[PDB]
RNA sequence: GAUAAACGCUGAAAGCAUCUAAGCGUGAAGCCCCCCUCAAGAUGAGAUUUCCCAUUUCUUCGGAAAGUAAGAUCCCUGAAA
RNA sequence: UUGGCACCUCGAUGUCGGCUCGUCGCAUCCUGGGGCUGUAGUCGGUCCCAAGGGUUGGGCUGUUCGCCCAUUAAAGCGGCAC
């Protein structure tokens, strides 16, 4: 069970040896460094803490500079933990290159979905519009709040609200190409996020 | 309960350990029921006389007997496979029966219990723990149990199957 | 007039360790609720908290008479529709015995702000060991 | 299995037993299997 | 993983029988895990790593006031929000 | 459900069907597990366990309902101010 952090660069497409044309997300994962190994004795669970892209000194604070020092590395923009991995693999201050993944490998991409802002129930919850004609004054509205008897609205009556910007995990994305000199993975299909989004690629739990 | 020769019994609380030539058994009994070890003879003692105890009192002599008899001479449950193409092969330790299914069904013999097949159309479960011999033979029979129309399936040795058209 | 009223901190709150091994869940609980409410002290004042701290050890060995192990159901409602979860007392004694005794005893304490303070004085342990040795707890018999 | 309030021997091979505090008749003839 | 209905094994009460009383096993789209997300206001406020340090003034001890540290903000340029 | 009663509301508890949104019960329509079968097999029937999810597009009728066309694993029955 391997893992790595990268930024979504954007999508494109590649021709397979077969000749088929597949869509791909390009994930640039330069500058992954192991920062900390968490053990059952010290923290209470096994995990490896990986720092991703280098951050200018003035953008870091002393708490940050003092935590990366232990790994003899510059401060990092993103730090995430990976559970369910072999702590024997991974040394403090080691690089984590995209070569940990091969072609045909099956991964789970985790990231935050694009922000839609305040949205209504048609876009946010896929509800039905009311009629648009035949005298209707009921188009993009959320429907009855519920029955009379409770004298209240049940929880999970779906209503308008802020829509995206949620952690999402797409499971079972095939890695298509691994390019070490450019520190790039091509994952088949799309992963959550806007371009430049942090994407967490771990070996598929399934 | 008369202990045969070579057999030994020990009592370290409310549990009894019956070790003999063929194997070695342990069984936790009800504390209330008191057991007496002599040289060659065991006697199980009932304290009161309620519907709770009278029951336990019997169960103990019988299980204790079934622990002693089981380590001395042992227990055999013999099964028959009736039907066309219904055969049993033992290819290592795993018992393997072809019994009409599109896949073969295989059984790894539990610790202490030993499957073996003289003919292809009969299986014999052997062991010391009459309980464990019982639960393997049952499970083997439960693969394809005796159907009432032709009599096809895996039955016990002297078992009466009901018949129909 | 003249009836004594305990002041906060006045009465000496002592630490007691109670072995739950083989005592009925209630029977254990009713005695402890009394010790927590401080009903065993002549200084008992209904509005104060003159009661003792209680550590229960071996709560995994608490007793359930009859079929209560399988038939006593503990219910929780999330407040979402159809959000009713249930656990059997037996399952809960095996896995979260701390929680079994806490539920049991929380029902026999007053249902007010003071009752919520009393419950903070209760320390339940599945096994035989606690980390409250520093409070020098005294063994208590039921 | 016949599940019914009134569980009675249907033939003379029928036997009335109790299991798990339910009354039942068992019989060679499987049509006679009853549980209360 | 534990169960329902169900099928059993071993087994006495009741020298037999008996799935049951003690005791084992098998067994559902269900139950609890597993999968996804939120989640320590979990006031029961949890854990790990790293940073800052023990200043000054008066004050009855209690504490109060003031400049600071690490750090954060106001303000400004913005968008992937 | 058809009713009985007249207990709340006549200084207003203001409406049948449809639409939108569901949620609950289980007396289960489908899917899962099982017993019996007039269970050879296939296709079925019936009862037990089971409420996790699922459970449709039209024509005619204001019509709930119904009838019909064509599907579907199935086109469940009820409650929530019908
Ligand atoms: Mg946006
Ligand atoms: Mg529509
Ligand atoms: Mg309009
Ligand atoms: Mg209310
Ligand atoms: Mg028997
Ligand atoms: Mg099982
Ligand atoms: Mg009148
Ligand atoms: Mg009014
Ligand atoms: Mg039912
Ligand atoms: Mg119409
Ligand atoms: Mg209405
Ligand atoms: Zn009969």
Curated annotation (Swiss-Prot), chain A:
GO terms for molecular function, please?
A: rRNA binding; structural constituent of ribosome
Q: Where is this region: Disordered?
A: 125-147
Q: Which Pfam families match?
A: Ribosomal_L3 (PF00297)
Keyword entries, A-Z: Ribonucleoprotein, Ribosomal protein, RNA-binding, rRNA-binding
Q: What SUPFAM superfamilies has UniProt attached to this entry?
A: Translation proteins
Q: InterPro entries attached here?
A: Ribosomal_uL3, Ribosomal_uL3_bac/org-type, Ribosomal_uL3_CS, Transl_B-barrel_sf
Which Gene3D superfamilies does the UniProt entry name for this protein?
3.30.160.810, Translation factors
**Which GO biological process annotations does it have?**
translation
Alphabetical GO CC annotations of the entry are: cytosolic large ribosomal subunit
* Quaternary state and interactors: Part of the 50S ribosomal subunit. Forms a cluster with proteins L14 and L19.
- Give the family, as the similarity comment puts it: Belongs to the universal ribosomal protein uL3 family.
What this chain does, per the entry, is described as: One of the primary rRNA binding proteins, it binds directly near the 3'-end of the 23S rRNA, where it nucleates assembly of the 50S subunit.
**Per its record, how is this protein called by name?**
Large ribosomal subunit protein uL3
Organism, by scientific name, is Listeria monocytogenes serovar 1/2a (strain ATCC BAA-679 / EGD-e)
The gene name reads rplC
From Swiss-Prot, chain B:
Quick check: keyword Cell membrane in the entry? no
Q: Which UniProt keywords apply?
A: Ribonucleoprotein, Ribosomal protein, RNA-binding, rRNA-binding
Keyword Cell membrane included in the entry's annotation: no
Q: Where does the chain cross the membrane?
A: none
Biological process terms from the Gene Ontology for this record are: cytoplasmic translation
Q: What domain of life does the UniProt record list for this protein's source?
A: Bacteria
Q: How does it assemble?
A: Part of the 50S ribosomal subunit.
The family annotation for this protein states:
Belongs to the universal ribosomal protein uL6 family.
* Full protein name: Large ribosomal subunit protein uL6
Native source species: Listeria monocytogenes serovar 1/2a (strain ATCC BAA-679 / EGD-e)
- Which gene underlies this protein? rplF
Swiss-Prot record, chain C:
Q: Which UniProt keywords apply?
A: Ribonucleoprotein, Ribosomal protein
Q: Which domain of life is it from?
A: Bacteria
- Residue ranges annotated as coiled coil are none
Q: Which GO terms describe its molecular function?
A: mRNA binding; structural constituent of ribosome
Q: Which GO terms describe its biological process?
A: negative regulation of translation; translation
The record's section on SUPFAM superfamilies has: Ribosomal protein L13
State the GO CC annotations.
Answer: cytosolic large ribosomal subunit; ribosome
What Pfam families does this protein map onto? Ribosomal_L13 (PF00572)
Which InterPro entries does this entry report, sorted A to Z? Answer: Ribosomal_uL13, Ribosomal_uL13_bac-type, Ribosomal_uL13_CS, Ribosomal_uL13_sf
**Which Cys-Cys disulphide bridges does the record give?**
none
Family, as annotated: Belongs to the universal ribosomal protein uL13 family.
Q: What does this protein do?
A: This protein is one of the early assembly proteins of the 50S ribosomal subunit, although it is not seen to bind rRNA by itself. It is important during the early stages of 50S assembly.
Matching HAMAP family: Ribosomal_uL13
The record describes its quaternary structure and partners as: Part of the 50S ribosomal subunit.
Query: What's this protein's name?
Result: Large ribosomal subunit protein uL13
Q: Which species does the entry assign this protein to?
A: Listeria monocytogenes serovar 1/2a (strain ATCC BAA-679 / EGD-e)
List the lineage, top down.
Bacteria, Bacillati, Bacillota, Bacilli, Bacillales
Swiss-Prot record, chain D:
Is Cytoplasm tagged as a keyword?
A: no
* Any one Gene Ontology cellular component term annotated for this protein: ribonucleoprotein complex
* Keywords, in A-Z order: Ribonucleoprotein, Ribosomal protein
Q: What residue intervals traverse the membrane?
A: none
Single biological process term from Gene Ontology: translation
- What sections of the sequence does the record tag as coiled-coil? none
User: What family classification does the UniProt entry report for this protein?
Assistant: Belongs to the bacterial ribosomal protein bL36 family.
Name of the protein this chain belongs to: Large ribosomal subunit protein bL36
Q: Which organism does this record belong to?
A: Listeria monocytogenes serovar 1/2a (strain ATCC BAA-679 / EGD-e)
């Amino acid at each position: 069970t391997k893992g790595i952090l990268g930024r979504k660069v954007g999508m494109t497409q590649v021709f397979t040896e077969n000749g088929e044309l597949i869509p791909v997300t390009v994930i640039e994962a330069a500058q992954n460094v192991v920062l900390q190994k968490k053990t059952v004795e010290t923290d209470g669970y096994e995990a490896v803490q990986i720092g991703f892209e280098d951050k200018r000194a003035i953008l870091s604070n002393k708490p940050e500079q003092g935590h990366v020092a232990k790994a003899n590395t510059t401060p990092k923009r993103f730090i995430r933990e990976f559970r369910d991995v072999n702590l024997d693999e991974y040394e403090i201050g080691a690089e984590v290159k995209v070569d940990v993944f091969a072609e045909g490998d099956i991964i789970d991409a985790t990231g935050v979905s694009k922000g839609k802002g305040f949205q209504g129930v048609i876009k946010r919850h896929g509800q039905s519009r009311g009629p648009m004609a035949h005298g209707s004054r009921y188009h993009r509205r959320p429907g009855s709040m519920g029955p009379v008897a409770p004298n209240r609205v049940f929880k999970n009556k779906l209503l308008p609200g802020r829509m995206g910007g949620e952690q999402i995990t797409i499971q079972n994305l095939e890695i298509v190409k691994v390019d070490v000199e450019k520190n790039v993975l091509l994952v088949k299909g799309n992963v959550p996020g806007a371009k430049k989004a942090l994407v967490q690629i771990k070996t598929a739990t399934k | 309960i008369v202990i045969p020769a070579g057999v030994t019994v020990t009592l370290n609380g409310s549990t009894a350990t019956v070790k003999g030539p063929k194997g070695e058994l342990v069984k936790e009994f009800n504390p209330e029921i008191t057991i007496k070890i002599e040289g060659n003879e065991i006697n199980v003692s009932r304290p009161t006389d309620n519907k709770n105890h009278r029951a336990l009192h019997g169960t103990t002599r019988a299980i204790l007997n079934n622990m002693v008899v089981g380590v001395s001479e042992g227990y055999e449950k013999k099964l028959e496979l009736i039907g066309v193409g219904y055969r049993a092969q033992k290819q290592g330790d795993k018992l393997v029966l072809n019994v009409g299914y599109s896949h073969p069904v295989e059984f790894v013999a539990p610790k202490g219990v030993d499957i073996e097949v003289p003919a292809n159309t009969q299986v014999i479960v052997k062991g010391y723990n009459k309980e464990h011999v019982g639960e393997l033979a049952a499970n083997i029979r439960a693969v394809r149990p005796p159907e009432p129309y032709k009599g096809k399936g895996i039955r016990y040795e002297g078992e009466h199957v009901r018949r129909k058209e | 007039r003249t009836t004594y009223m305990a002041k906060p901190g006045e009465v000496e709150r002592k630490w007691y360790v109670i072995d739950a091994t083989g005592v009925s869940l209630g029977r254990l609980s009713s005695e402890v609720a009394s010790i927590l409410r401080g009903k065993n002290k002549p200084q008992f004042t209904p509005h104060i908290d003159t009661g003792d701290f209680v550590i229960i050890i071996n709560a995994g060995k608490i007793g359930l008479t009859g079929k209560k192990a399988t038939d006593k159901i503990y219910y929780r409602h999330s407040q979402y529709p159809g959000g009713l979860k249930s656990r059997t007392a037996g399952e809960m004694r095996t896995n979260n015995p701390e929680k079994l005794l806490e539920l049991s005893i929380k029902g026999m304490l007053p249902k007010n702000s003071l009752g919520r303070q009393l419950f903070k004085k209760l320390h339940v342990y599945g096994g035989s060991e606690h980390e409250h040795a520093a409070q020098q707890p005294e063994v208590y018999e039921l | 299995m016949k599940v019914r309030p009134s569980v009675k021997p249907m033939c003379e091979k029928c036997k009335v037993i109790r299991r798990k505090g339910k009354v039942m008749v068992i019989c060679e003839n499987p049509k006679h299997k009853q549980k209360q």
